[PDB]
Amino acid sequence: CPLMVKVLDAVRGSPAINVAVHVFRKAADDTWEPFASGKTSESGELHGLTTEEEFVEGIYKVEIDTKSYWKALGISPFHEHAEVVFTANDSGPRRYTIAALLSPYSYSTTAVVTN
Amino acid sequence: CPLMVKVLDAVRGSPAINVAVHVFRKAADDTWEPFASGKTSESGELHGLTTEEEFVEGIYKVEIDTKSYWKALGISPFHEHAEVVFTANDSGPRRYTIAALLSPYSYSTTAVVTNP
Amino acid sequence: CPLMVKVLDAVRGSPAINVAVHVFRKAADDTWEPFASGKTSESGELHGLTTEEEFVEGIYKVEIDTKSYWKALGISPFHEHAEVVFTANDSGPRRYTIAALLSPYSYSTTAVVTNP
Amino acid sequence: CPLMVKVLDAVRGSPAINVAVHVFRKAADDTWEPFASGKTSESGELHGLTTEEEFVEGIYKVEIDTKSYWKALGISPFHEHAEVVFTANDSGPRRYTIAALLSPYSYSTTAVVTN
Numbered sequence: 424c425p426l427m428v429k430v431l432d433a434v435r436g437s438p439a440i441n442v443a444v445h446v447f448r449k450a451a452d453d454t455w456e457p458f459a460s461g462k463t464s465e466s467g468e469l470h471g472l473t474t475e476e477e478f479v480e481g482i483y484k485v486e487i488d489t490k491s492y493w494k495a496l497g498i499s500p501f502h503e504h505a506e507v508v509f510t511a512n513d514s515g516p517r518r519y520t521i522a523a524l525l526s527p528y529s530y531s532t533t534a535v536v537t538n
Numbered sequence: 539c540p541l542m543v544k545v546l547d548a549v550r551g552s553p554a555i556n557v558a559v560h561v562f563r564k565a566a567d568d569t570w571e572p573f574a575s576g577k578t579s580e581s582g583e584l585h586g587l588t589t590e591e592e593f594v595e596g597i598y599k600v601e602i603d604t605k606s607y608w609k610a611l612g613i614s615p616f617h618e619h620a621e622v623v624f625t626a627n628d629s630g631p632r633r634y635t636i637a638a639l640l641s642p643y644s645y646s647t648t649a650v651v652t653n654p
Numbered sequence: 655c656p657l658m659v660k661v662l663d664a665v666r667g668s669p670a671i672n673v674a675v676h677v678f679r680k681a682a683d684d685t686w687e688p689f690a691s692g693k694t695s696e697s698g699e700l701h702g703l704t705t706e707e708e709f710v711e712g713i714y715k716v717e718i719d720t721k722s723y724w725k726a727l728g729i730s731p732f733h734e735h736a737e738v739v740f741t742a743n744d745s746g747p748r749r750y751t752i753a754a755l756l757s758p759y760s761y762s763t764t765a766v767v768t769n770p
Numbered sequence: 771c772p773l774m775v776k777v778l779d780a781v782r783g784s785p786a787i788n789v790a791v792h793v794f795r796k797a798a799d800d801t802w803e804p805f806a807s808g809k810t811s812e813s814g815e816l817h818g819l820t821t822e823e824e825f826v827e828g829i830y831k832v833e834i835d836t837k838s839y840w841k842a843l844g845i846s847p848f849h850e851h852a853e854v855v856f857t858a859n860d861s862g863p864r865r866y867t868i869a870a871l872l873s874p875y876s877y878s879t880t881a882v883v884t885n
């Protein structure tokens with residue numbers, strides 16, 4: 424799995440469970456086309472989004488559906504979703520972990536790219 | 539000024555200066571969209587993007603051009619840009635500060651929302 | 655004002671008001687330490703902690719009393735406080751803004767350091 | 771292992787490897803007494819700091835030696851170290867993960883507490 428998404432909850436100090444995540448790849452005409460999606464597990468992680476074969480170089484967008492997450496918890500959120508937009512580059516063997524740490528009015532996100 | 543954008547640099551410990559910012563508003567057709575744009579000052583702030591009159595209720599996207607920022611400093615960062623998407627003015631007019639703290643492979647963003 | 659502390663609330667999207675802040679400076683004996691203290695204003699800022707004269711070179715610790723903050727709002731947070739430890743003025747006088755963005759189980763902190 | 775420390779590097783987008791971490795427990799006289807220490811692994815993680823038996827309720831401080839980390843990379847840092855101070859509470863079965871995401875002039879830290 425060249426791509427993994429991990430989401431944490433900064434209010435409860437826990438994995439953010441059952442968060443919907445949609446990934447898109449930018450198409451030639453500049454539009455975003457659906458690529459992969461899923462919901463985070465009990466560990467706050469989403470594995471198996473794509474394969475090495477499918478995850479070619481290109482520009483990708485990872486949308487984390489934070490608004491629904493907070494709504495299900497009865498908490499008023501600011502953002503519609505969190506978005507992470509990046510270019511995947513074939514610089515030797517690499518795995519991409521996109522992490523996000525969520526609060527109602529703020530989030531942090533980072534990439535951990537390893538071989 | 540009901541909308542202000544502030545950007546900081548976590549590598550240098552300074553305001554992030556000359557960062558391009560583009561704001562979009564979702565249209566009736568569900569497309570993004572252009573609404574306003576500008577660049578951060580020497581204080582890392584961008585004021586005067588809009589007016590109370592023009593900044594009506596809607597879904598807005600603030601795109602902060604982080605890649606251009608890092609590349610102008612000779613660094614190859616991870617993200618294309620930082621995107622902040624939110625509904626504004628759904629309970630009447632508010633003042634919004636959208637802040638972002640930037641590193642080459644990471645960013646954080648928060649909003650401070652006040653009522654005049 | 656060579657030292658300013660700013661605190662934001664990531665739950666409410668607001669300045670963190672009335673947050674107690676204690677600053678310490680490492681002494682010759684290697685103990686912390688008292689140096690200055692105060693509380694954030696309605697803007698979430700704490701100015702006037704010290705003067706250019708008193709704020710000499712040294713190792714400083716800014717302790718932000720986050721637990722007291724969250725408990726006064728009826729929340730049980732993870733951390734006792736947020737601690738920011740840094741050497742100041744080692745290359746001559748600078749102006750320091752120490753910022754912290756607070757959530758019940760998390761915080762971020764950054765410094766903006768400028769030269770007058 | 772009731773306590774794990776994880777450190778990430780926001781400049782390189784990688785685990786922060788070989789970072790020294792010192793844990794202290796607050797003693798009756800209010801002083802901090804050494805409790806456990808180690809260095810993060812290639813995954814940026816530090817496991818095996820303590821046992822269930824030893825990790826009783828109390829106030830703990832986790833010091834992450836960020837200054838030396840940045841110095842070894844030739845990068846000028848702001849902080850002497852990052853410090854995380856918290857009370858451990860016996861509210862049923864719990865594991866504490868203290869995470870920190872490091873930049874030269876900033877860091878974020880969060881707790882993930884799970885059963």
Ligand SMILES: O=[N+]([O-])c1ccc(O)c([N+](=O)[O-])c1
Pocket residue numbers: 429431522523524531532533644776778869870871878879880
């Ligand atoms: O996964 N993490 O450990 C972790 C910690 C702090 C963070 O701020 C983030 N982040 O920005 O996504 C991730």
Ligand SMILES: O=[N+]([O-])c1ccc(O)c([N+](=O)[O-])c1
Pocket residue numbers: 529544637638639646647648660753754755762763764
């Ligand atoms: O505005 N600030 O001072 C400030 C501090 C820390 C932060 O993490 C952020 N942020 O996420 O945008 C902003």
